[PDB]
Symmetry: C5
Subunit: 208 residues, 5 copies
Amino acid sequence: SLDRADILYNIRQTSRPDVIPTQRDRPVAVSVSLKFINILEVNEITNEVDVVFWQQTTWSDRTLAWDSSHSPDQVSVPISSLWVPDLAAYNAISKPEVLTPQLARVVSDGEVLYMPSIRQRFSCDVSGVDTESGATCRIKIGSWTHHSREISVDPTTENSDDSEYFSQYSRFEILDVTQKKNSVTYSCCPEAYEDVEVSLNFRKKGRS
Amino acid sequence: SLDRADILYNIRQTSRPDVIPTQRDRPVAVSVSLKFINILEVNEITNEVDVVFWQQTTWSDRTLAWDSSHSPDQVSVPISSLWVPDLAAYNAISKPEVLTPQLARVVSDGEVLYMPSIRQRFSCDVSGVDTESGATCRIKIGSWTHHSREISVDPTTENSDDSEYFSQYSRFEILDVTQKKNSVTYSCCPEAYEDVEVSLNFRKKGRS
Amino acid sequence: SLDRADILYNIRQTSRPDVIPTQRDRPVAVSVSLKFINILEVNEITNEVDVVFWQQTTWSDRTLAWDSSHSPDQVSVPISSLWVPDLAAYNAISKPEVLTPQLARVVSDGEVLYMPSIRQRFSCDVSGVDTESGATCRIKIGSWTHHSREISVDPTTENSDDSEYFSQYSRFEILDVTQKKNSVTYSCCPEAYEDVEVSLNFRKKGR
Amino acid sequence: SLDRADILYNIRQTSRPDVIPTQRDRPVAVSVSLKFINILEVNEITNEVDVVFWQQTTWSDRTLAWDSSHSPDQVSVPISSLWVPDLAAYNAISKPEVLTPQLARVVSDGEVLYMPSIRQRFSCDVSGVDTESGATCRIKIGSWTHHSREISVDPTTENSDDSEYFSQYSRFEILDVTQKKNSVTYSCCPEAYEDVEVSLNFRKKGRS
Amino acid sequence: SLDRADILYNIRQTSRPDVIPTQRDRPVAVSVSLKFINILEVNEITNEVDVVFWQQTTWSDRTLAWDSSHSPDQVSVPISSLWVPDLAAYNAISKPEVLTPQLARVVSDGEVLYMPSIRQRFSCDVSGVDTESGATCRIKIGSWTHHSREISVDPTTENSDDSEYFSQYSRFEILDVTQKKNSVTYSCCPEAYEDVEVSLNFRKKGRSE
Ligand SMILES: CN/C(=N\[N+](=O)[O-])NC[C@@H]1CCOC1
Ligand SMILES: CN/C(=N\[N+](=O)[O-])NC[C@@H]1CCOC1
Ligand SMILES: CN/C(=N\[N+](=O)[O-])NC[C@@H]1CCOC1
Ligand SMILES: CN/C(=N\[N+](=O)[O-])NC[C@@H]1CCOC1
Ligand SMILES: CN/C(=N\[N+](=O)[O-])NC[C@@H]1CCOC1
């Protein structure tokens, strides 16, 4: 039997945080799912939104796996000990302000879950925010330097209510969230980069 | 007679900052109590408030214990040398600004006390703040990555006064403070994550 | 049958982050290209703009090279493990805010592509911004400490399109972007500092 | 012989940054003295000020001492290489913005002098700011984790001018400064933390 | 038989970044010159100014010196790998925001040039900014912890053009910059601290008559 200290030690022995854990020459399947918590500061003039969301990020790194027979099957681990996907919001206009402890969960099979609460500002369509049908702000997230042969990005469609963790005290409300998968090619390169496009359909709440 | 240096060096060689100090496979029992020192930058339209609180945080790591018959029975220790609970306010919308030195006290029996002064912005019900009944702003605080089997969160056992350390110079006054245990399951997982929900009943001082 | 872990391990052994990778006494040929993504704030009175651009930067560090005949020919690498050109915008009035992960792409032949997305404020000519012919804001980017014999700077004057990646949600639009080679030289010293002058010809949308 | 390089070397290898340098079992005598440099922003509605002060801070760490018969008797040392008292402003509402290089001065006897320029925001009484009487903003500075038996806090006895280095360009002027020894105690515990109360008596300057 | 990597490796082992390289009993002669590039927010009610400037900082460190017979006689070196004067603006009300790569130039005789673009806010006399004769904002720069006998600050005696690099797109224009020298003794300590006073005389462009 190993304790949590032994597991963490074994992870720091086999984890190479600067090396993508591809198996075969297959891409690492990264899942990304936003859970919007708040919409803080909207500007229809400048098409800018300030949003708080939980970024559900899962992937597998088999280098972290251990025997969990008579031992715990999960640990919390600082992300600086692990390879993490180099996700970027393509239409972000501020750095991500990470509000939560920078720890990820690692399961004994090597499945990793990182879920930071992030506050960030985006350039996106705010038109119609004060109308009844709302604005639809599209947020694009994928790897910054890993193309499709290295990272696949995919949404996990089991939306635990679009507006489930969303603050009831926002001035805004969510009408709909659709998370569609997408790709882009840049003439720099022959390569394509996978992204999740997250469409946030929201509006200012009416008054009685 | 061990001196403070000896006490510290023992802690350094034993403490594991990235390893939760569970006993057997029981949860680490963490205690959290917010002393409110100030309410600032209130906004009833956006439902947002800055708060300054001392976040009293107690837990035990019995491996750190020493005999304090002919030696000091407490030392100040930088938190970077200790495991510290990965606490987070679930309805924070800014990262905590830690106003005080990041030092904890380790007692010779293995009890640890970290009490940082934190300024932080929250999304919560600010309605009625200028009325007599006041507003009730609920702050949730618990482990981000450790479920109920790994970390338990409990309010401090005693009900000390609400405005005891509260700036007399604030534009607001506290009417009542209420700390209640709580526990949520999330879409990610079947396990539950414990929190203390602090209910801050406060209002603007009457013009007197 | 080398792998990504080998490639990185070898980079760690050969790479000198603080040492300019000049061959002989020939300058490190650095290529710079700004791709404008957004223009966020413009001030017609103060002559200041807040912009978002991808700064596509390429150079060669031959010490990084490896045989990729039976292994990957490219890896993503943190810039802390590489030497990076000490580029600065001469007319910037804020620190560069790097929005993206700080990883460069390294090719097996030693070629490096670093492409940060950067938000930054600049002091430049905003006159004309509210007219059809628009304003012309020039950004000067070159090495801060390495002269012409040490670093050379050149645009990637390809068939590069202006608004290809530019946000349609900006209140401004790009009319044209020309990136021309230049050299500043500062009164004191017989040392010329090469730069790219990026002329951003833009206007506010609407009548 | 024994040049500055040797002195820095010995400091670096003798210093214990995380261990208080208590001579025998008596508190570390810390001296604190704010010299006000500016009052930037003030708000009489919110009872908040933004001030700039040099924090003259002296104490002794005897282990650092060296023989300066044939060598220098004073060196500048980065505080990161030194034990430094864990001072906090109890009524601070912002992190101390240190404006100067983080170097202290070490004397061959072991006396350390650290004097950072700090810009910081405080919650204090601002009422009267635009009268002849003026306002009196009290600032409390003591150790955050070390009680009376570990750290003692005294104002420096120097009878210096109160406006001496204060900016003539500030919108405000200082009528008087009083720096007074005090302690604070909490209902949790019997231990007392010593502090200086600094009483800033200032007002808005007239055009006349 | 020596390249740039060799020069850096040798600097690393000779260089003591936390040791001022005083020679014998002399102070280290630091010379300081501000090349004003921009003047941003100005507030006359509050007497505060936001300024961008290149802080031309030069000094000698013979520990760094090497033989440049068959090697480069100058390298760019990160400032963390060498000793740097602990300069401070006395009347600054914000941390210096360094806009450029933090690299210094080292010549093989051990002469060091370090010249960050700095953006920083100051408390100084802004009254007059919207007048013909303009405002004069004084910026005092000197060592924070080294006294006259350890560091000396003297203004670059070069007869510089004041607005040589000053943005033509600024709202302000520079009338004059003058750099004097001072030696102040405070209340903590018996020794004197050298400073350069930089008087920046400037005003708004495009005023009437
Ligand atoms: C976002 N655009 C992009 N390329 N491009 O536009 O030519 N990404 C791939 C780059 C490879 C290194 O980091 C980014
Ligand atoms: C200042 N307040 C205090 N107790 N209290 O407020 O009840 N003790 C010192 C704390 C010990 C750990 O960090 C600070
Ligand atoms: C708060 N949300 C949560 N799950 N969820 O929202 O689906 N779990 C906690 C996460 C476990 C790993 O990092 C944090
Ligand atoms: C600049 N001011 C000064 N004294 N004073 O103002 O009373 N001495 C230098 C101090 C020595 C260590 O930190 C700074
Ligand atoms: C770019 N500017 C320059 N001269 N100048 O501005 O007067 N030389 C390079 C300097 C070498 C050290 O830091 C910058």
